[PDB]
């Protein structure tokens, strides 16, 4: 979800709306804002649907005033409803929050029994009634919030307002991000600096436990207790472009086309003279990485798929045992820890709840250390890991990851090179990987010029409701990732298989209507994969084969061959992802689906 | 595929047909037979389709004579065609074969260049033209076959006939099973004794390299060279019932209902006084199993799914690191071998080509040892493993495994108990597992009495083309197995997910038409799973929850709760499989699909 707050001299409603538009990719099931004018007349508006529903409403009933808070949300529990939309109130108290109040249930009973009525089942109302109760003796809002916060347990961020005293906002960071934007004679707050770029580039990042008292002219941050702490303001490092689509129709589209440049940025400072350079990790990292006998990778969704590709690399190239597991399963099992095991999390956001819970469990279980591969500076996974290797792909706004996945593989391959060197293996392994990486942005630039043939193919998917994706070896998780892209944004029921598994049952699914998408680099598995493709064609499947130009496939009625330029084997999985990203994009366009904000979802699963 | 041969005084055509009916589950894309009368007039008949197509043809054109061979086949390459149906000929030579002639291609060119014409691309014709060439100087058929066999490389079984001399059949076992049935004044051969039960129970199992010269009155087996070897005939140990359906409409149905009795048979001799007893493994097995620090399980399809369940058991109960991998991916990767690693294959048939290739690779890679868990005495995996633990489930004929899967889990759980004892862990782990196992046939008998409610539910799937299955923890591979059953035999596009993965993309698939099947034991993951189910319901999914009676689910419009009796947690995955087997069965009935012989498949993938 996304939180924006604002305390200014000028009206803030437009600012709060522009803030929600920018955080929309985090939840687009509902949104609301509440604005108090200097006279304390508070106007609250809440709508079901995308932020535009709220903006439209606001245009009919405009909201005057300098103080306000706003929210946009991914509704998990129950069908989304306007009754549950934020902000929530308790008379004069008004509240928005992100994250979770773990002890929702006892606090609720206790407030009920003190005489409160609950209009919703949200945690937000719990926080509202509680602060109302804390104020009932008559102190300052800050005083009540200091009393209130210790009674709340869980991982959450909240902004709180007393409409009787529109001069001050209170915010409390306790598990979920909050950041204050510093203006001139006005201040703002948000769950992500991205929402505040249009009015300020100067930010104070609250640390866990911080409570902030914010007026037009002052920012006072206090610790756990009531003691003031010092927090440095800094200049934004995000791009000025941020959540602008530029010439692109979709964020996803932009992010697919940005991949050559994002990859270059992932590589900056990290390749030198035919070798990989990960000295940014510092003068104790080699000692650690040198002791690694086993790698455990933990991730969700597309970040799990890149870990699955790298497993083939780590075992075959660095000779290191590597397991990859989805984090929602790992975090609850009673696992057997390998000797000398490195925990690697992959996460674009660095905030995914299950991945984060895996990392926290791993400390307790005695792994050797942990390495974060992350796209977000200063996210939870980065600060709680022993080591971090940032992807440098830039902000990613498309709910479906494209550039995050391919820059993750780039970094994995670097770490494969580094480990192969620390183990004293053939120097050629590192050389060949570095040759790969060095060609990679140009190879991707070159694959993107196949976009028009893929766009033409996508029209065939117009009447389709199913698809199968097939790959073998290190291309098998590339099939997984293409099937996930396709089903997530076009809603075709796409399913991936390692090609060797069909004759054990799934081949029953093939009839004359089933399209089957395959990635076919010209490598030692080509003949084995060709056999699989023939098994599919023999039962009437419609084949779409992205194959190397010299693979020798013969095009026909049910065999559509999209010829691919040559590529270094070591980077072949990254290259073959690109056509599947384009195909998913184009099919979604044909289907008329919301490519950037697919239904039932939002980006980054930060609450379990 | 399935091979039958016969050399008798009486007509053999009916016998050869009855033989193919019994081997049909091995391939039902085409079949053929060739029969020579005492005058050497040879009649060959071949039909596309199930064996009944051939039998019907035979009823129109009956085939007299005492000598013949027959085949039924799973067509892999190309659309099945009558031109490719076996037997194949080269004038007077007639041949059927199973397996693969790896050097098909050079032998073919060489025969072409000697003047042969090829009517098909089958390996069978290669063998036929080659034996024709070997006879062209004029020796005995046996002589030519001894010259021919060394020129063939690969894993295959073949029976060969010269219609000019109907007095003798030649067969050669070189990688694929052959067995001779001994009659009285007549002999038979088949690729599996199951085909010969109706005329004999006395068998000679050929060993690899064996060449057999078979007449009405004699069986001479020769080794690699021309030297005679001794092979003992034995009495069949299969059940008299074998490939009879009895009162059951389908083999699959029978095999589902047999599970309590099959499980009892898996347990016989192996539980004693609250402890597991695996002393059948012998007086060097404990030494081995005692050194195990890591377990690698290799299997395909449903046998991979049982390995995935046991991974949760091995790590959480015996504290042993366990990886599970599909064998088609394992056999071609350059893997990193763990120290002290036990290779475990799971296979009903004991002959699955990829699983077998994994086991063979593991010898070469230096694992500690290998353990086969198999349903077939004397199959390849059993004889090439260091240790074997048979499931004792009895012959399984349904192309889709039911009893094989559940008896595999039973044996896995026993081995978990044994390892937990060898490691000196809490004695209660073994006790609780043995309490589980001891209740298990009755718990299964009790689940089978829920069949009528499941049959009623299945009618809802009549208009459905998709389904999702959800599970967490050790029930997650139970969802995988239920989705595989459903898609294999009903052709609904069923897909399994660990419940925690939906919000990372797959939840986009949920609309008002999607049925979602969930297994919900009353265990520590119930509340976490309930959250997932609510996420699905909130977007309009149709929930089918097989839940413990005390799980507290509330039934409604899109929430169908099938209440399950209580069960011991340790056996909960085995118990919750049963309702998904029944549901798949009943949905297939509603859809009017061939439950026992699903399209595009056959049972056991014995050629890659
Ligand atoms: O982007 C997608 C789908 O295309 C998601 O599957 C994620 O990859 C995921 O939810 C993990 O998120 P991060 O941990 O990478 O932030
Ligand atoms: O029965 C099924 C499908 O329900 C197959 O997926 C197999 O389990 C498989 O082909 C492995 O065969 P076996 O190795 O167990 O003989």
Distance, in Å, from the CA atom of A409 to the CA atom of A404, rounded to the nearest integer, reads 9
What distances in angstroms separate CA B327 from CA A29, B203, B332, one per listed residue?
A: 43, 32, 9
Sign (positive/negative) of CA torsion A471, A474, A477, A483? negative
Secondary structure (DSSP) of A30-47: EEEEEEE-TT--EEEEEE
The tokens for B336 are: 């990193």
Provide the 8-state DSSP code for A185: S
**Are A178 and A192 a contacting pair, CB within 8 Å?**
no
**Are A125 and A88 a contacting pair, CB within 8 Å?**
yes
Q: Which residues contact A564 (CB under 8 A, 6 or more apart)?
A: A447, A450, A521, A546, A547, A548, A549, A575, A576, A579
Distance, in Å, from the CA atom of B599 to the CA atom of B28, rounded to the nearest integer, reads 9
The tokens for A517 are: 């998408």
Give bridge partners of residue A407 from the DSSP assignment. none
The tokens for A84 are: 């549950």
**Are A211 and A170 a contacting pair, CB within 8 Å?**
yes
* Total residue count of chain A as it appears in this document: 608
Q: Does the CB atom of residue A301 touch ligand 1 within 6 A? A: yes
CB atoms within 10 A of CB A8: 19
Distance, in Å, from the CA atom of A175 to the CA atom of A353, rounded to the nearest integer, reads 11
Provide the 8-state DSSP code for A228: B
**Are A314 and A416 a contacting pair, CB within 8 Å?**
yes
Going by C-alpha positions, the residue among B387, B385, B392, B388 that lies closest to residue B410 is B392
Sign (positive/negative) of CA torsion B595, B596, B600, B601? positive
**Are A348 and A396 a contacting pair, CB within 8 Å?**
yes
Domain A440-593, what fold? Rossmann fold (3.40.50)
Q: Min CA distance, A502 vs chain B (Å)? A: 9
Helix (H) or strand (E) holding A323: strand A322-326
With contacts defined as CB-CB under 8 Å, which chain A residues touch B534? Answer: 76-78
- Equal CATH topology for A241-439+594-608 and A440-593: yes
**Are B194 and B163 a contacting pair, CB within 8 Å?**
no
- Mutate which of B301, B411, B481, B485 for ligand 2? The one with the most ligand atoms within 8 Å of its CB, which is B301
CA dihedral A386, A392, A393, A398 (to 10 degrees): 50
Secondary structure (DSSP) of A58-96: HHHS----SEEEEEEE---SSS--TTTPSPEEETTEEEE
Query: Long-range contacts of range B124-128, CB-CB < 8 Å, 24 or more positions apart?
Result: B124/B86, B124/B87, B124/B88, B124/B95, B124/B96, B124/B97, B125/B88, B125/B90, B125/B95, B126/B101, B127/B88, B127/B95, B127/B97, B127/B101, B127/B152, B127/B158, B127/B160, B128/B88, B128/B89, B128/B90, B128/B93, B128/B94, B128/B95, B128/B160
Q: Does the CB atom of residue B401 touch ligand 2 within 6 A? A: yes
How far is C-alpha A481 from the geometric centre of its chain's CA atoms? 15
Distance, in Å, from the CA atom of A341 to the CA atom of A334, rounded to the nearest integer, reads 16
Q: Is A1 a catalytic residue?
A: yes
Q: Does the CB atom of residue B380 touch ligand 2 within 6 A? A: no
> Which of the four CATH numbers 3.60.20.10, 3.80.30.20, 3.30.450.20, 3.40.640.10 does domain A1-240 have?
3.60.20.10
Quote the ligand 2 centre to B305 CA distance (angstroms).
10
**Are A305 and A477 a contacting pair, CB within 8 Å?**
yes
With b meaning 16 or more CB within 10 Å and e meaning fewer, what string describes A407-436? Answer: bbbbbbbbbbbbbbbbeeeeeebbebbbeb
Distance, in Å, from the CA atom of B413 to the CA atom of B317, rounded to the nearest integer, reads 10
CB atoms within 10 A of CB A555: 12
Distance, in Å, from the CA atom of A515 to the CA atom of A493, rounded to the nearest integer, reads 11
Q: Does the CB atom of residue A355 touch ligand 1 within 6 A? A: yes
Contact B323 A319 (CB under 8 A): no
Contact B75 A499 (CB under 8 A): no
Nearest-CA residue for atom 3 of ligand 2: B400
Distance, in Å, from the CA atom of B461 to the CA atom of B456, rounded to the nearest integer, reads 10
Beta strands, E only, B228-317? 234-235, 271-272, 275-276, 294-299
Sign (positive/negative) of CA torsion B350, B353, B357, B360? positive
Contact A495 B498 (CB under 8 A): no
The tokens for B415 are: 């081995």
What distances in angstroms separate CA B6 from CA B142, B229, B240, B397, one per listed residue?
A: 17, 22, 21, 23
Ligand 2 atom closest to B485 (CA): 4
**Are B31 and B47 a contacting pair, CB within 8 Å?**
yes
Candidate from B75, B321, B333 with C-beta closest to A338: B321
Distance, in Å, from the CA atom of A31 to the CA atom of A55, rounded to the nearest integer, reads 10
Edge-to-edge strands of the sheet including A169-174? A88-90, A93-99, A156-162, A169-174, A211-214, A219-222
Distance, in Å, from the CA atom of A440 to the CA atom of A64, rounded to the nearest integer, reads 53
The two beta strands, A211-214 and A169-174, are antiparallel
Q: Which residues contact A79 (CB under 8 A, 6 or more apart)?
A: B538
* Total residue count of chain B as it appears in this document: 608
Distance, in Å, from the CA atom of B416 to the CA atom of B311, rounded to the nearest integer, reads 10
CB atoms within 10 A of CB B274: 11
The tokens for A599 are: 């239904």
Angular region, B49: left φ>0, alpha ψ -120 to 50, beta rest: left
Provide the 8-state DSSP code for A168: -
- Mutate which of B27, B300, B412 for ligand 2? The one with the most ligand atoms within 8 Å of its CB, which is B300
Distance, in Å, from the CA atom of B484 to the CA atom of A506, rounded to the nearest integer, reads 7
Give bridge partners of residue A516 from the DSSP assignment. A468, A543
Q: Which residues contact B172 (CB under 8 A, 6 or more apart)?
A: B145, B149, B157, B158, B160, B178, B210, B211, B212
Distance, in Å, from the CA atom of B446 to the CA atom of B219, rounded to the nearest integer, reads 50
Distance, in Å, from the CA atom of A392 to the CA atom of A320, rounded to the nearest integer, reads 26
Nearest-CA residue for atom 14 of ligand 2: B347
Secondary structure (DSSP) of B229-240: -----EE--S-T
How far is C-alpha A272 from the geometric centre of its chain's CA atoms? 31
- Bond prior to A87 in cis (omega within 30° of 0): yes
Angular region, B409: left φ>0, alpha ψ -120 to 50, beta rest: alpha
With contacts defined as CB-CB under 8 Å, which chain B residues touch A337? Answer: 321
Distance, in Å, from the CA atom of B376 to the CA atom of B382, rounded to the nearest integer, reads 8
**Are B352 and B300 a contacting pair, CB within 8 Å?**
yes
CA dihedral A360, A361, A362, A365 (to 10 degrees): 140
What distances in angstroms separate CA A555 from CA A218, A542, A549, one per listed residue?
A: 69, 12, 12
CB atoms within 10 A of CB A219: 16
Distance, in Å, from the CA atom of A533 to the CA atom of A547, rounded to the nearest integer, reads 12
Going by C-alpha positions, the residue among A376, A394, A19 that lies closest to residue A196 is A19
Report which bound ligand comes closest to the CA of B404.
Answer: 2
Distance, in Å, from the CA atom of A325 to the CA atom of A298, rounded to the nearest integer, reads 5
Q: What is the resolution of this structure in A?
A: 2.0
Distance, in Å, from the CA atom of B44 to the CA atom of B275, rounded to the nearest integer, reads 59
Say how many CA atoms lie within 13 Å of B314 toward its Cβ.
24
Ligand 1 atom closest to A399 (CA): 1
CA angle at residue B43 from B41 to B48, to 5 degrees? 170
Nearest-CA residue for atom 12 of ligand 1: A604
How far is C-alpha A217 from the geometric centre of its chain's CA atoms? 34
Provide the 8-state DSSP code for A601: -
The tokens for B154 are: 């690969």
Q: Could you tell me which CATH number the domain at A241-439+594-608 has?
A: 3.40.50.10490
Secondary structure (DSSP) of B549-606: TTS----BTTEEEEEE----GGGHHHHHHHHHHHHHHHHHHHHT--SSS-TT--S---
With contacts defined as CB-CB under 8 Å, which chain B residues touch A400? Answer: 505
Distance, in Å, from the CA atom of A608 to the CA atom of A175, rounded to the nearest integer, reads 13
Going by C-alpha positions, the residue among A580, A591, A71, A19 that lies closest to residue A302 is A580
The tokens for B290 are: 């005692």
Residue carrying structure tokens 């037009």: A216
- Bond prior to A415 in cis (omega within 30° of 0): no
Provide the 8-state DSSP code for A379: -
Report which bound ligand comes closest to the CA of A407.
Answer: 1
Query: Long-range contacts of range A239-242, CB-CB < 8 Å, 24 or more positions apart?
Result: A239/A394, A239/A395, A240/A197, A242/A22, A242/A194, A242/A197, A242/A395
CA angle at residue A191 from A187 to A196, to 5 degrees? 45
How far is C-alpha B469 from the geometric centre of its chain's CA atoms? 24
Sign (positive/negative) of CA torsion A21, A26, A31, A34? negative
Residue carrying structure tokens 């029930």: B475
**Are A43 and A65 a contacting pair, CB within 8 Å?**
yes
Q: Decide: helix, strand or coil at residue A354.
A: helix
**Are A281 and A387 a contacting pair, CB within 8 Å?**
yes
CA-based R_g, chain A, Å: 26
What distances in angstroms separate CA B434 from CA B110, B416, B441, one per listed residue?
A: 62, 11, 13
Contact A504 B598 (CB under 8 A): no
Going by C-alpha positions, the residue among B256, B476, B352 that lies closest to residue A328 is B476
**Are B176 and B191 a contacting pair, CB within 8 Å?**
yes
Going by C-alpha positions, the residue among B561, B321, B115 that lies closest to residue A337 is B321
Give bridge partners of residue A228 from the DSSP assignment. A222
The tokens for B291 are: 């050194």
Quote the ligand 1 centre to A602 CA distance (angstroms).
10
Q: Which residue is closest to A314 within chain B, CA to CA?
A: B336
Angular region, A273: left φ>0, alpha ψ -120 to 50, beta rest: left
Say how many CA atoms lie within 13 Å of A517 toward its Cβ.
35
**Are A305 and A346 a contacting pair, CB within 8 Å?**
no
Helix (H) or strand (E) holding A390: strand A387-390
Give me the residue spans of the domains in chain B: 1-240, 241-439+594-608, 440-593
Q: How was this structure determined?
A: X-ray
**Are B407 and B391 a contacting pair, CB within 8 Å?**
yes
Give bridge partners of residue B468 from the DSSP assignment. B495, B516
Q: Is B363 a catalytic residue?
A: no
Ligand 1 atom closest to A349 (CA): 16
Quote the ligand 1 centre to A351 CA distance (angstroms).
10
What distances in angstroms separate CA B564 from CA B432, B477, B572, one per listed residue?
A: 21, 19, 11
**Are A458 and A583 a contacting pair, CB within 8 Å?**
yes
Distance, in Å, from the CA atom of A197 to the CA atom of A181, rounded to the nearest integer, reads 9
Report which bound ligand comes closest to the CA of A404.
Answer: 1
Q: Min CA distance, A191 vs chain B (Å)? A: 21
Distance, in Å, from the CA atom of B100 to the CA atom of B607, rounded to the nearest integer, reads 7
Going by C-alpha positions, the residue among A322, A321, A327 that lies closest to residue A304 is A327
**Please, what's the largest Cα pairwise distance for chain A?**
82
Q: Does the CB atom of residue B508 touch ligand 1 within 6 A? A: no
Distance, in Å, from the CA atom of B256 to the CA atom of A400, rounded to the nearest integer, reads 42
């Amino acid at each position: 979800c996304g939180i924006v707050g604002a305390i200014a001299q000028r009206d803030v409603a437009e600012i709060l709306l522009e803030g929600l538009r920018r955080l929309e990719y985090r939840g687009y099931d509902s949104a609301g804002l509440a604005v108090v004018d200097a006279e304390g007349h508070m106007t609250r508006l809440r709508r079901l649907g995308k932020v535009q529903m709220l903006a439209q409403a606001a245009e009919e009933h405009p909201l005057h005033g300098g103080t306000g808070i706003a929210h946009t949300r991914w509704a998990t529990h129950g069908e989304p409803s306007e009754v549950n939309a934020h902000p929530h109130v308790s008379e004069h108290i008004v509240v928005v929050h992100n994250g979770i109040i773990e002890n929702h249930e006892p606090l609720r009973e206790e407030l009920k029994a003190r005489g409160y009525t609950f209009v919703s089942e949200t945690d937000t109302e719990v926080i509202a009634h509680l602060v109302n109760w804390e104020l009932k003796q008559g102190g300052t809002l800050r005083e009540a919030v200091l009393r209130a916060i210790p009674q709340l347990r869980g991982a959450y961020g909240t902004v709180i307002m007393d409409s009787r005293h529109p001069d001050t906002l209170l915010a409390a960071r306790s598990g979920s991000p909050l950041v204050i934007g510093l203006g001139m004679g006005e201040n703002f707050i948000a769950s992500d600096q991205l929402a505040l770029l249009p009015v300020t580039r100067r930010f104070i990042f609250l640390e866990e436990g911080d409570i902030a008292e914010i007026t037009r002219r002052s920012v006072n941050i206090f610790d756990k207790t009531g003691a003031e702490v010092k927090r440095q303001d800094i200049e934004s490092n995000l791009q000025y472009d941020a959540g602008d689509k530029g010439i692109y129709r979709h964020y996803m589209q932009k992010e697919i086309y940005e991949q050559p440049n994002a990859i270059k940025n992932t590589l900056t400072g990290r390749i030198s003279h035919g070798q990989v350079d990960l000295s940014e990790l510092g003068p104790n990292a080699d000692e650690l990485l040198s002791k690694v006998e086993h790698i455990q990778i933990l991730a969700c969704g597309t970040s799990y798929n890149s870990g699955m590709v790298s497993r083939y690399w780590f075992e075959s190239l660095a000779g290191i045992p590597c397991d990859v597991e989805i984090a929602s399963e790992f975090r609850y099992r009673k696992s057997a820890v390998r000797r000398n095991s490195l925990m690697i999390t992959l996460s674009q956001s660095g905030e995914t709840a299950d991945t984060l819970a895996g990392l926290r469990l791993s400390k307790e279980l005695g792994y050797l250390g942990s390495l974060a591969i992350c796209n977000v500076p200063g996210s939870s996974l980065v600060r709680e890991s022993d080591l971090a290797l940032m992807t440098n792909a830039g902000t990613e706004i498309g709910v479906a990851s494209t550039k995050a996945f391919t820059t993750q593989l780039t970094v994995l391959l670097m770490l494969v090179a580094k480990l192969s060197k620390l183990k004293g293996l053939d120097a050629s392994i590192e050389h060949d990987i570095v040759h790969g990486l060095q060609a990679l942005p140009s190879r991707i630039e070159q694959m993107l010029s196949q976009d028009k043939r893929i766009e033409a193919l996508a029209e065939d998917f117009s009447d389709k409701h199913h698809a199968l994706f097939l790959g073998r070896g290190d291309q098998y998780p590339i099939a997984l990732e293409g099937a996930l892209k396709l089903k997530e944004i076009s809603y075709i029921h796409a399913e991936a298989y390692a090609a060797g598994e069909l004759k054990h049952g799934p081949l029953a699914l093939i009839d004359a209507d089933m399209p089957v998408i395959v990635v076919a680099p010209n490598n030692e598995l080509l003949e084995k994969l060709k056999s699989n493709i023939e098994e599919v064609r023999a039962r009437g499947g419609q084949l779409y084969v992205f194959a190397d130009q010299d693979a020798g496939f013969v095009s026909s009625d049910n065999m559509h061959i999209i010829e691919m330029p040559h590529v270094e084997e070591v980077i072949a999985p990254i290259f073959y992802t690109v056509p599947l990203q384009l195909l998913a994009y184009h099919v979604a366009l044909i289907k008329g689906t919301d490519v950037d904000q697919p239904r039932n979802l939002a980006k980054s699963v930060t609450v379990e």
